Design an enzyme around this catalytic site. Structure first.
Site, PDB file in Angstrom:
ATOM      1  N   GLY A  46     -19.612  12.122  34.156  1.00 56.41           N
ATOM      2  CA  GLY A  46     -19.796  10.813  34.743  1.00 56.41           C
ATOM      3  C   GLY A  46     -21.177  10.554  35.303  1.00 56.41           C
ATOM      4  N   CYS A  98     -14.635   3.584   1.577  1.00 56.73           N
ATOM      5  CA  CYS A  98     -15.355   3.640   0.309  1.00 56.73           C
ATOM      6  C   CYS A  98     -14.414   3.705  -0.884  1.00 56.73           C
ATOM      7  CB  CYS A  98     -16.323   4.827   0.322  1.00 56.73           C
ATOM      8  SG  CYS A  98     -17.661   4.560   1.528  1.00 56.73           S
ATOM      9  N   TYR A 151     -24.318  10.896  34.137  1.00 56.92           N
ATOM     10  CA  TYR A 151     -25.351  10.273  33.317  1.00 56.92           C
ATOM     11  C   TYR A 151     -25.255   8.752  33.371  1.00 56.92           C
ATOM     12  N   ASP A 164     -17.194  14.051  29.788  1.00 62.68           N
ATOM     13  CA  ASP A 164     -18.453  14.271  30.471  1.00 62.68           C
ATOM     14  C   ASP A 164     -18.238  14.155  31.975  1.00 62.68           C
ATOM     15  OD1 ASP A 164     -18.182  11.509  30.797  1.00 62.68           O
ATOM     16  OD2 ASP A 164     -19.649  11.049  29.229  1.00 62.68           O
ATOM     17  N   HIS A 168     -16.055   4.392   8.279  1.00 58.75           N
ATOM     18  CA  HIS A 168     -16.945   5.035   7.326  1.00 58.75           C
ATOM     19  C   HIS A 168     -17.972   5.916   8.031  1.00 58.75           C
ATOM     20  CE1 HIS A 168     -19.912   5.852   4.301  1.00 58.75           C
ATOM     21  NE2 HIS A 168     -20.799   5.390   5.167  1.00 58.75           N
ATOM     22  N   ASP A 225     -24.188  17.485  36.963  1.00 65.10           N
ATOM     23  CA  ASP A 225     -25.578  17.891  37.140  1.00 65.10           C
ATOM     24  C   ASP A 225     -26.395  16.685  37.573  1.00 65.10           C
ATOM     25  OD1 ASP A 225     -25.467  16.550  34.708  1.00 65.10           O
ATOM     26  OD2 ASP A 225     -26.935  17.860  33.735  1.00 65.10           O
ATOM     27  N   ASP A 283     -22.306  15.220  20.100  1.00 63.63           N
ATOM     28  CA  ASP A 283     -21.636  13.948  20.315  1.00 63.63           C
ATOM     29  C   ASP A 283     -22.704  12.872  20.324  1.00 63.63           C
ATOM     30  OD1 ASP A 283     -22.443  14.518  23.347  1.00 63.63           O
ATOM     31  OD2 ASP A 283     -21.932  12.395  23.215  1.00 63.63           O
ATOM     32  N   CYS A 314     -14.232   8.637   2.137  1.00 66.64           N
ATOM     33  CA  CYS A 314     -13.432   7.955   3.146  1.00 66.64           C
ATOM     34  C   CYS A 314     -12.635   6.796   2.545  1.00 66.64           C
ATOM     35  CB  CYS A 314     -14.320   7.475   4.299  1.00 66.64           C
ATOM     36  SG  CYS A 314     -15.030   5.804   4.162  1.00 66.64           S
ATOM     37  N   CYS A 341     -19.070   9.299  -0.736  1.00 69.75           N
ATOM     38  CA  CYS A 341     -18.194   9.417   0.420  1.00 69.75           C
ATOM     39  C   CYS A 341     -16.726   9.335   0.024  1.00 69.75           C
ATOM     40  CB  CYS A 341     -18.542   8.309   1.411  1.00 69.75           C
ATOM     41  SG  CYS A 341     -17.496   8.231   2.885  1.00 69.75           S
TER      42      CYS A 341
HETATM   43 ZN   LIG Z   1     -17.193   5.969   3.312  1.00 68.18          ZN
END
Ligand SMILES: [Zn+2]
Ligand SMILES: [Zn+2]
EC number: 2.4.2.29
Lengths: 368, 368
Positions: B91, B308, B93, B89, B334, B141, B265, B305, B303
């Site tokens: 910077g 899990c 913000y 980004d 997760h 900006d 994001d 992952c 899930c």
């Molecule tokens: Zn998971």
């Protein structure tokens, strides 16, 4: 595999190398046990460093989430996802340092987190370690402060031996535990040779699977610790493992192996990790120091760990300075890996009859 | 690979799926970008969740360790060990929210960590992103608060368009950056359709590699955000990626894709992780709640992952309650994996012409 089998493969002086076979795996000795969660590391990462066994802190687990709850959820191995051996301490040390009324029956104390009152006795300590599903169970003893008068050291040693017999009987009363786990006794007696001998004699008469040297690393300094080990370890049964609780720095470990110790645990590599201290073969460094802010080298030039393969001192410096979780993850992985590499070099040098030279070479470089 | 190539493979209504090809890798769109260190995760773990690109926060990096230092050490990719694309980004913000004197030239501000004074301008922001080695560079900006009067929203939009031209010229002046990185412009104009149109027209006349919709997720609520996206996204060039900055919750993402957004994001899955919030297909849960203390199920029943696969709600509950680093590691892994699985289901449903049905089914279950 058997419930418990300790085999000595090679010796050099008082130093030994070998294996402990247990139902959940083989432990190579001399062994370093990381202390547990092992902070900031998944179990697979702990294993990848070379650890064969971890230590579980009974005092913390009995307060949260509680031993009965861990048993209801399937035991500590299943809960945290480590399927290899776990040694649990008795809980008594942290009671005397973190939480009190003591008596011949045990100790009552208030939780340092909620003020709730709790109780520990030889019988309840063994029961909690059963509920956690520990593979190596520690007898419950009474700590001796340093310094201690001869009368105080004798009284606490004698109580500890009475409690060792109660721990033995409690362990043996529980069929599942007696058949699948091991029980270690703890030698007491402070710095006094006659008390250490009486304690060793009492423990061997009861009979344990292994023997810890208790009451050291309590402020006495390395010279005094080594002097006590000099006469204390030979009093223990030679054919069983010898465990030095709460030790320690790399140079402490090397000197203790030279005096016949087979097993070690300490929070130092984990606690130091989050604090900024990284171990190297040239001595510890504090990665927070500004001198590392643009240092592209790994934490240690020889270390084979995944952290030293991938990230620079400069990056870890920036993480630790910023208080990032990843800085603790990386420092802890490296420090535990360093300790395992130390233990491997110790085992190899004993197996090859060159441990004396290794110890000399290690100290010369580590303290250069 | 080319410097930058955006290809649309399939469409359904306003929704698109496709790829961005860059020198450091391919980005599948719609894409979720985790925000960076990505807290409590090694880069290899971030990649294992499915992330194709991460976001670097320029404001934090310019304060510590500093952009010039990161450049001296080889750039951000080498420093943190992520070799795939990074979007940075501008910077600006975080200056307006964490650190001030603003003018047409830029902003001067005092560091929130040391009180040191710093400066950001279009030119210096582009320079810092060059020094970090960013693959996707954001134009600098001026933010518009919500709510904003029409006059204020117009003044800040007009300044932002002047700064967009300065960002374009700064980027193009630097041969290495112009040849290897991409530059995104940011549409402003608050909730006002005529200002959004003027901003889109100005940005397209300058010409950018992609277009962000700025000034949303600043307190306006989901209904108003979706209403602004309804008319704002069609004003942007169709053949370039559309990036909604700072969004957001899973339902925000689904609705924004329905309105033509390609990139997202947010810190939510990481920040929520350390806070106890876990995303599931049945809605978010707070793992700290006592109802999970003996729950042996994984965080989410579907899930895929690694968390899990291996650990229970009950264990993660205990870790988060105790403030353990590993609890943050597991919750964050997760949550990021959940977001990537969401993006994969979105991409697949668009590719198969069933995204409308997916969006209906997702919302029905997530809010049941
Ligand atoms: Zn998971
Ligand atoms: Zn290392």
């Amino acid at each position: 595999r058997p419930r418990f089998s300790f085999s000595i493969a090679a010796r050099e002086g008082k130093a030994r190398t070998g294996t402990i076979e247990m139902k959940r795996g083989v432990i190579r000795t001399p062994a370093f046990m990381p202390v547990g969660t092992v902070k900031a590391l998944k179990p697979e990462t702990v294993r990848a460093t070379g650890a064969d066994i971890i230590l579980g802190n009974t005092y913390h687990l009995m307060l949260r989430p509680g031993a009965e709850r861990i048993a209801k959820l399937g035991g500590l191995h299943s809960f945290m996802g480590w399927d290899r051996p776990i040694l649990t301490d008795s809980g008594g040390y942290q009671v005397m340092s973190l939480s009190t009324k003591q008596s011949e029956e045990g100790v009552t104390f208030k939780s340092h987190l909620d003020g709730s009152r709790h109780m520990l006795s030889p019988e309840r300590s063994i029961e909690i370690q059963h509920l956690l599903g520990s593979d190596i169970v520690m007898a419950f003893d009474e700590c001796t402060p340093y310094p201690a008068t001869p009368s105080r050291a004798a009284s606490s040693m004698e109580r500890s031996m009475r409690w060792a017999k109660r721990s033995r009987d409690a362990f043996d009363s529980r069929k599942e535990q007696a058949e699948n786990a091991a029980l270690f006794g703890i030698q007491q007696g402070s710095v006094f040779e006659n008390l250490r001998q009486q304690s060793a004699d009492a423990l061997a008469e009861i009979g344990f699977d292994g023997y810890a040297v208790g009451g050291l690393a309590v402020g006495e300094g390395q010279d005094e610790m080594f002097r006590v080990l000099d006469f204390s370890v030979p009093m223990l049964p030679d054919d069983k493992p010898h465990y030095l609780m709460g030790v320690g720095k790399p140079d402490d470990i090397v000197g203790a192996v030279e005096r016949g110790i087979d097993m070690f645990d300490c929070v130092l590599p984990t606690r130091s990790g989050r604090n900024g201290q990284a171990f190297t073969w040239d001595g510890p460094i504090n990665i927070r120091n500004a001198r590392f802010s643009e240092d592209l080298k790994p934490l240690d030039s020889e270390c084979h760990c995944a952290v030293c393969q991938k990230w620079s001192r400069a990056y870890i410096h920036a993480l630790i300075r910023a208080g990032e979780i990843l800085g603790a993850m990386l420092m802890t992985e490296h420090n535990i890996a360093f300790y395992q590499q130390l233990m491997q070099k110790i085992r190899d040098s004993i197996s090859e009859g060159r441990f004396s030279q290794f110890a000399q070479d290690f100290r010369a470089r580590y303290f250069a």
